[model samples]
Target: KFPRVKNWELGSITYDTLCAQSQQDGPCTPRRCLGSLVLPRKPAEQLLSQARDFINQYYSSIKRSGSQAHEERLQEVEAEVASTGTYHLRESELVFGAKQAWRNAPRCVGRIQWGKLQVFDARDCSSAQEMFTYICNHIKYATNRGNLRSAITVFPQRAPGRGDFRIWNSQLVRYAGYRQQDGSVRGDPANVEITELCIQHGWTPGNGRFDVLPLLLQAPDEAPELFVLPPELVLEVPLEHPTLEWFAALGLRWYALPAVSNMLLEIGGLEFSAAPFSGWYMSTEIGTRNLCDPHRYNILEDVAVCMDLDTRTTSSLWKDKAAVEINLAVLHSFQLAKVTIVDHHAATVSFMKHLDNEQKARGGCPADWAWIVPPISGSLTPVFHQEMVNYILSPAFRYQPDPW
Candidate 1:
C-alpha cells in the first residue's frame, strides 16, 4: 500500500510508492506514530542477494545493467564469498556506496548536496598509528581552512572471525566534559564518559570548557590507543553577536567540523565500522541544539539575560527572542569568518528543492519529519508541513556500539 503524502502549505498531494522497496520496520504501527525515534541479516544466500541487488543498482546507474562487467563482478563476489567466507568492495564500489549512503540518510536535513563528498579509502591501514595519520589528513582536507568540505574517511571493515577497526569517539571532534566534585558537568555534558576514558588512557586532560578530546583508535584485537589531534588541525570559530559586541566576552566557540565517527556503514553485505563522515554545520544544529539545549551548553538564559530581556515569564517570549538572536549571531559570525554554514531558512528551502528532485528520481524520499525540520521555529520552515515517509534503506549509515 502506498502512502498519500500532503503539503499543508500548498495543498498538494503525492502518493509515495517507493516505501514498498523498504524491507525494514520503523517505530510505527497501525495505532502509534513514534516517528521521532532517532537512534534505533544472514550468510551466503543473503550476501549473494544483497550483492546482486547492489550490483544491479550500480550497473543501472551507469546504464549498463546485465553488461559483461556487471556479470563478471557478480561472479567474482560469489567466488570470493564461496572460498573466503567474506569479500571486499572495489574502490569504485565503495565510493558509490558511500555517496548513496549519504543520500539515503533520512535524519540529515542537508542531503541536498550529498553527492560531492570526498571519500578517503583507509581500508589498507593496518595500525592505529596509520589511522591517526589518515584522520589528521582527513581533518586538514575537510576543514579546508574553515571552508569545510563534505567528507568521509573509511578505515576498515569487520572481517569474518576477526575483530573490527574502530574509533571509540562518537564524533571525531568533541569537547571534554569533566565531572566536578559539586556533581555538575564542567564542559559538554554529552562527552563526560569519553573524556574520562581519555584521562584513564594516560592523556593529560584540559580544564577548559571547550577542550578537545583525543581519539581512541583500535585495530583488530588490540587495545585502544589515544591519539591527540594537533590544535592547528581542528578549525574553531569564536562566536560574537553582530550588534551586542559584549557577546564576545562569553568566550563561546565551536569547532567547524562535525565528523561523526563510530557509525556502521553497510554496503551490500559488508560492514565498515569506522567510516567517519562529516559535513558543514547547518546554523540551527549549532545555534539551537548544541548551544541552547538544556543538556548542552544551556546558554539561552545567559544569552537572554545579556540581551536585557525579561525571563521571569513565558508571555514575554524571551526565549524565542533570544534564540533568534543567537541563530543570527551564529550566521553572521560564520559568514564573517568565511566558514561553511547554512541558515535554517536557506537549508529548508534547499531541502524542499531536494525533495522535488528525489520525487522525480526515487518515486519518494525516506524522510523523518522530526529530524528534517529545524530545531528552532519549526513551523516557519518549509519541511515542517510536508508529510514524509520513514523507512530503512540499504547502503546506509547506522549507529554502532563503541569499543571501551
Candidate 2:
C-alpha cells in the first residue's frame, strides 16, 4: 500500500512537472529525464527532482530498516513493481463507459501480478442481459494473416496416427508412412516416428486446407499473441444461451481493442476441411496454462473464449474446466515462442467427428467454432467429415509491430 501511494504520487509529480514546463515563457532544450525525455520549464525539472527525492526517501526507509526480513519485504515489493501485476495506474477519474460497464460486471477482485492483464470475470455481472448491454455499445473488430499465408505446416512431437490411431501432422508432409507415401501402414501407434527430414507432413490436396509448411521449432518464449474470434455479424442481443449471451458479445469488444487484439484475429478465418482433423481448441498445453500456472495465472489463457452468435457478445468461458485442443499441430516441432510443451492432451478422433457434425448443423461458413472445442467436447472426440475450412480472410490483416 505504501509503495502504491508512493508510485501514484510519483506520477502526479512527473505530470505536474511537464505541465509547468510546457507553460514556460522561455523555451528550454529537450532533455532526457527519468525514462521519458521532455522539453519543459525549470519548474518541471524541479518536479522531476522532487519525484526522484521521493524514490530516494522510500529507498532510505528500507536502508534504515535493514535486516533479512526487512530486505525480503523490499524484494517482494520490488517484484510486484517489476511485474506491475497489481498496480492500478488509472490516474485520472475513471471514464463513464468503462465505469458503467463495471457497474454491471464490477471491477475484478483478486490478487494480480501488477504488470499482467487480468481477464475480468464477466459472469459477475448482475445478469447475462446486463453483460450484453455493455457489448452492443463498445465492441470493434480486426485481424492479421502473415503466418497463415507463409505456407505454414503443423508437426507434433509424435507421429501422425490413423483414424484415432496415429499422430496427425497436417502442416507439411515429407515424412515416411504418411498416407501419401505408404497406402499400407503397420507399426505401434506410440512407436510411429516423425522424422525431422519430413517435418511438414503436407498440405491438404485441393484448394489447400491446412497451412502446411515445414514444422518450425515451437517458440514459447514469444508472448502468446491475441487470436481474435472470427468477426461475428453485427449483433444486437444475446443468442441461444442466455448465460453466454452477454459474454459472447461483450468479450469480443474487449478482444477487438486495437492495442491488444491481433494474434486472435489471425486465427479467425482458419477452417480445415478434409485432411482428417477438422476442428481445433486452445489448451493449457499450448501456452494457455502459462497464465494459469501457480506462478502466473494468465487471464488470456484461463478464460473460456466464445462468441455469442445471437447477441454477438464475446467472453471468457471461465467454467474452470479444461478446454480441448482445437488447432492442428506437429505437437513436438511447433513451439509457442517463449514457452515449450512440457506436456499435452490429445482429443479423441471422435471429437473431430463431433466438430464436423456441429459445424454442419450450425451452418458452417465463415464461422469457425474453434473456441467451443476446448470447453464443450471432452478431451477426446471424433471426426465426421474429411474436409476443413481455411476460411481465414487473408489480405485484410495489418500486422502489428514485432512485440520484442
Candidate 2, lDDT over the whole model: 0.23
**TM-score to true structure, per model:** 0.98, 0.16
User: Stretches of candidate 2 above 4 Å error?
Assistant: 1-372, 375-387, 394-399
- Candidate 2 local lDDT, 1-404, one digit each (tens): 01111112123211111111111122223373221212223333433333233233333434644556545544553454446422111111112112211111101111011112212222222322332332222222111210110011111111123211111222112112223345433211111233222333332222121111122111223211111112341211111222333333322111101121111111111111111111111233333332233332233332344421222233443333322221112122223221112122333233333333433532321212232223233233321112222122211112232222
Candidate with maximal TM-score:
1
Error of 2 at 110 (Å): 27
Q: Which digits, one per residue and each the tens of the lDDT, describe model 1 over residues 321-365?
A: 989988888888898899999998999999999989998998888
**Number of the top lDDT candidate:** 1
| Per-model lDDT | 0.90, 0.23
